[PDB]
Design a protein around this nucleic acid. Structure first.
Ligand SMILES: [Mg+2]
Ligand SMILES: [Mg+2]
Ligand SMILES: [Mg+2]
Ligand SMILES: [Mg+2]
Ligand SMILES: [Mg+2]
Ligand SMILES: [Mg+2]
Ligand SMILES: [Mg+2]
Ligand SMILES: [Mg+2]
Ligand SMILES: [Mg+2]
Ligand SMILES: [Mg+2]
Ligand SMILES: [Mg+2]
Ligand SMILES: [Mg+2]
Ligand SMILES: [Mg+2]
Ligand SMILES: [Mg+2]
Ligand SMILES: [Mg+2]
Ligand SMILES: [Mg+2]
Ligand SMILES: [Mg+2]
Ligand SMILES: [Mg+2]
Ligand SMILES: [Mg+2]
Ligand SMILES: [Mg+2]
Ligand SMILES: [Mg+2]
Ligand SMILES: [Mg+2]
Ligand SMILES: [Mg+2]
Ligand SMILES: [Mg+2]
Ligand SMILES: [Mg+2]
Ligand SMILES: [Mg+2]
Ligand SMILES: [Mg+2]
Ligand SMILES: [Zn+2]
Lengths: 116, 177, 52, 80, 66, 136
RNA sequence: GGUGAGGUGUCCGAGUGGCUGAAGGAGCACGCCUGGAAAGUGUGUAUACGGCAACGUAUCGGGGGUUCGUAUCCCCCCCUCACCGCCA
RNA sequence: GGCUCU
RNA sequence: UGCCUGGCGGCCGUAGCGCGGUGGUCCCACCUGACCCCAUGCCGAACUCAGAAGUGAAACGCCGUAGCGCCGAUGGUAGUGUGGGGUCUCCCCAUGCGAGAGUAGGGAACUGCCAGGCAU
RNA sequence: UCCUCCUAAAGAGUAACGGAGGAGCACGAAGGUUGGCUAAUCCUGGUCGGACAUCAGGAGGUUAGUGCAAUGGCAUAAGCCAGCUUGACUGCGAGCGUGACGGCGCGAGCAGGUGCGAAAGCAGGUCAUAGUGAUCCGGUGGUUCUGAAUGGAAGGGCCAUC
RNA sequence: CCGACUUACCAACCCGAUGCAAACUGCGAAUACCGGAGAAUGUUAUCACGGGAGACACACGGCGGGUGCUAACGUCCGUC
């Protein structure tokens, strides 16, 4: 229901980046955690990934599902992407609103150095 | 939220006992109350609509959603898009507080009140009743009105069956019979 | 063919004009759009005038 | 003597169809399919026109293939 | 809820003839005096008494004796 | 006389009548009248052969009609030249291939069904035969 | 045989998509005048079926069809009116 | 002013 | 490496439904609250935010199950290209191709990348 | 004259006084973009309220919808709401389709400048296919291009347009 | 008014069985067509340009069809 309508809400821009050949950052948002992963243009393998389920990020935080955790995740995934040489991506909101934790994540990745 | 507290302390214990549910999430609960006034004569003039939304806005302190015709029918001389009614959805504390003022004040103020029906639960727990006259609520001033309206109340609850809602409202001493 | 034809005169002083149609019965108010003026190479407000 | 008819009309043939078939090397911009709807769909390196015309954005061979859960027919340009 | 469009919804006191003091949130503003509440409505006594069929044989035997 | 109540279209091409049939086996009843030849029947030929077997059984038993005339047949009027539109629909036919079971019957003996279907086949232009039900 | 138009309650008669289940009039019914009738005059006013009349539905030749909705629009069957059905 | 029949 | 879960794909019904069962450390879900970010042509329902008391009820996931859906031969049949023939509105012969429907049967998907949890 | 289906024989095309239907427009939003949503019908309950308004739940899963005919499409919706807007831009256009020709059509991309969006991106009218009329002549605005001795002008040319 | 019942009259949906379709399709050939590669053969048989034409009244026969009566040495198309 809500899961399916979120997928329907996301599957237009996903297919558009699929035909654009875009290396794509995928955000996923839960009430407790927030997830991020950089996916190759083939859509079958990832490059870097970050979350509030990881110990190295979650242990520095109060709650995993607030904006400060989402900015720490987008900073970590950006610093890993620039470590691996990935610089230009395209942000996939994955059916969420560009708002709140998603916006704070993408603003953190922009500030840390990704270009999107 | 007085009845919401009464739900959470005594109704849940009652229904868990009288149904032997495995989990407490398996219990019914009310979710929303819908207050429709179908005004089919407002195609003559907006002022009947404009006053019916004012009366129903005084009952429940929300601005009503003016509903319109889904399609056009000629037996009623209406076209698709005409405002033909008004509704109010009540959730949360305002739902409980209206439901308190309902079963405590307005139901006793019904002329020749003799009970409700237990045969109005739409097969799936959701109860629907219809009142003849808005003056049973004390929000309405008797001199200020001109037209005797009527509205209908629809309590949408999470009870799967019909009896689980009948026991839930009976747990709220809902005057069935 | 009730939909008469007009012209959208540049407000940049140039006599450049786009030509188009409108229903003058149902849209009595004048049409004003921001269009490209190829002489000045800017987007300029055009206004409705008579096709003449 | 007498009679008439009401069924004399017909329109001109619009010459639709597949102009370049599979395994057939094209230049960029070459029209592959003319069609009313999206009877076919645009795959890789293939654009869809205003009238659902499928044209090649690049050069190479035409590849017909069936993808998706709805088993829709996609046209792609292999590199060449 | 939205900010401006809704009417004032304020807690007032509604007392009744049975002395049922009840504080509710309402759009009235002033205090309310009732006539019957759910405590004092004759739903539990009056509707039980108010059928009152009466017997035809008992009226007959009542009107006299043989 | 059998006739469709509604049709999507008023007229139909002449077509052809080649191929074998599909309603070959005796489905419903016990005895059947199977077409061997090829051609087209009509609602009159169908209703006349139905009357001849209903009377031959004295309305005892049950008779199915497997076919139905759904093809309209046009004719041009007399003294009308070959142009100027398609002719007017005059009657309705059913295209009959070899092997088509035309009628079925039960509730009667075999010899009575033989003589009834013989009285019916005498009302039909095409050559017929008598068939019985079969397991598998 | 074809072309065109049309088919209106008791009668005539208007009525080319939304208070048209019908104007207006005559006629029919009822009342009054009249010793009695008329003529006047006044008031009304279709057939069915569902309940009970709360009003509802159907009915513009018949029968289908569309559009939310047709007495008005399209089709068929028809009926009638007008014109043509010629050259040899 | 004119206004039929019995 | 095993198990479980989440995300992104591959594939597009042997992958889908149905019926029954089962899961809560984590995850997920529901869930608590909302002056705030933001939102409701009314409503914190949704969207969003701040959270974590409770529950796996629903949903979801997993397991099982042939009531279906689905897949599906072999043989035959229909058709048909070429050549020939007949009783020529339609068929036949040689040769090549060869269905559909149906039957037996299969069948309660398979697989990749990353991350986390518990075991090892 | 134009559009859609069949005839049309599985590429295109294909005739008849063959079978059936439509067009000679509309829209300053019914266009663009961003964001969101998902029907028809039926069942039950429910004030006036009735076969049928509106309200709540369930089945169904597009049998609906598409500005209009039919066909092909449409869930990533091309269908439906709201916000901001004018890309219903100007100069070009590789390369193809289609016609005997005149002509008609599709088009990525380039330069300028613009709108929406955080951004990737999208936008050179509308889901597509009908909604149309050659040339001449003449009219209007702009442009020194020309200007019959010279300077102007008339007139002509070019661009837009009737 | 609520309704009584029974009943020799039909019937929606759904289910099962059975047919039909040029303007039906959850299937689907043979051929034909487009493109590529490869031999052998064929007096370049192919294409482009240029000079000169003629022709645009066809017929029957086979096959696939419309129309007509699966009537016509009929008519109108496709193909040989
Ligand atoms: Mg009417
Ligand atoms: Mg289950
Ligand atoms: Mg919530
Ligand atoms: Mg469960
Ligand atoms: Mg085989
Ligand atoms: Mg097979
Ligand atoms: Mg299965
Ligand atoms: Mg299963
Ligand atoms: Mg073709
Ligand atoms: Mg062909
Ligand atoms: Mg969108
Ligand atoms: Mg209802
Ligand atoms: Mg549109
Ligand atoms: Mg369109
Ligand atoms: Mg001339
Ligand atoms: Mg001079
Ligand atoms: Mg000069
Ligand atoms: Mg067919
Ligand atoms: Mg000629
Ligand atoms: Mg000729
Ligand atoms: Mg010829
Ligand atoms: Mg022939
Ligand atoms: Mg012929
Ligand atoms: Mg012949
Ligand atoms: Mg001849
Ligand atoms: Mg000829
Ligand atoms: Mg021939
Ligand atoms: Zn009281």
């Amino acid at each position: 229901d809500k899961k399916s309508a979120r997928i329907r809400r996301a599957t237009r821009a996903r297919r558009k980046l699929q035909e654009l050949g875009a290396t794509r950052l995928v955000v996923h948002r839960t009430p407790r955690h927030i997830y991020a992963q950089v996916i190759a243009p083939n859509g079958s393998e990832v490059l870097v990934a970050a979350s509030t389920v990881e110990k190295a990020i979650a242990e520095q935080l109060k709650y995993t599902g607030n904006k400060d955790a989402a900015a720490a995740v987008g900073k970590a995934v950006a610093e890993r992407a620039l470590e691996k040489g990935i610089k230009d991506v395209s942000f996939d909101r994955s059916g969420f609103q560009y708002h709140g934790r998603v916006q704070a994540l993408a603003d953190a990745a922009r500030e840390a150095g990704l270009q999107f | 939220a007085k009845l919401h507290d009464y739900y959470k302390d005594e109704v849940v214990k009652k229904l868990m006992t009288e149904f032997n549910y495995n989990s407490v999430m398996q219990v019914p609960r009310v979710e929303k109350i819908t207050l429709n006034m179908g005004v089919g004569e407002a195609i003559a003039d907006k002022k009947l609509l404009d006053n019916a939304a004012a009366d129903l806005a005084a009952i429940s302190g929300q601005k009503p959603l003016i509903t319109k015709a889904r399609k056009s029918v000629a037996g009623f001389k209406i076209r698709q898009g005409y405002p033909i009614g008004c509704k109010v959805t009540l959730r949360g504390e305002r739902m409980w507080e209206f439901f308190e003022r309902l079963i405590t004040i307005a139901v006793p103020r019904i002329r020749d009140f003799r009970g409700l029906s237990a045969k109005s639960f739409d097969g799936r727990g959701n109860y629907s009743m219809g009142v003849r006259e808005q003056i049973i609520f004390p929000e309405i001033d008797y001199d200020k009105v001109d037209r005797v309206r009527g509205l209908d109340i629809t309590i949408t609850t999470t009870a799967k069956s019909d009896e689980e809602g009948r026991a839930l409202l009976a747990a709220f001493d809902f005057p069935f019979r | 063919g009730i939909r008469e034809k007009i012209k959208l005169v540049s407000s940049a002083g140039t006599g450049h004009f786009y030509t188009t149609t409108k229903n003058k019965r149902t849209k009595p108010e004048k049409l004003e759009l921001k269009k490209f003026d190829p002489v000045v190479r800017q987007h300029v407000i055009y206004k409705e005038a008579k096709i003449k | 003597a007498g009679g008439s008819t009401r069924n004399g009309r017909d329109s001109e043939a619009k010459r639709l169809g597949v102009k370049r078939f599979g395994g057939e090397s094209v230049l960029a911009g070459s029209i592959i399919v003319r069609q009313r709807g999206t009877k076919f769909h645009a795959g890789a390196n293939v654009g869809c026109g205003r009238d659902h015309t499928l044209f090649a954005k690049a050069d190479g061979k035409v590849k017909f293939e069936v993808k998706g859960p709805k088993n829709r027919k996609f046209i792609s340009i292999e590199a060449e | 809820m939205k900010k401006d469009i809704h009417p004032k919804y304020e807690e007032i006191t509604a007392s009744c003839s049975c002395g049922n003091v009840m504080k509710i949130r309402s759009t009235v503003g002033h205090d309310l005096n009732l006539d019957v509440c759910s405590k004092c409505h004759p739903f539990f006594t009056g509707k039980q008494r108010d059928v009152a069929t009466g017997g035809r044989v008992d009226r007959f035997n009542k009107r006299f004796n043989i | 006389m059998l006739q469709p109540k509604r049709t999507k279209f008023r007229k139909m091409h002449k077509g052809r009548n080649r191929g074998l049939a599909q309603g070959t086996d005796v489905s419903f009843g016990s005895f059947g009248l199977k077409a061997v030849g090829r051609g087209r029947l009509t609602a009159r030929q169908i209703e006349a052969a139905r009357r001849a077997m209903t009377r031959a059984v004295k309305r005892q038993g049950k008779i199915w009609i497997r076919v139905f005339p759904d093809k309209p047949i046009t004719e041009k009027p007399l003294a009308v030249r070959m142009g100027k539109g398609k002719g007017n629909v005059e009657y309705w036919v059913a295209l009959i291939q070899p092997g088509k079971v035309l009628y079925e019957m039960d509730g009667v003996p075999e010899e009575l069904a033989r003589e009834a279907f013989k009285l019916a086949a005498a009302k039909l232009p095409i050559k017929t035969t008598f068939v019985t039900k079969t397991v598998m």
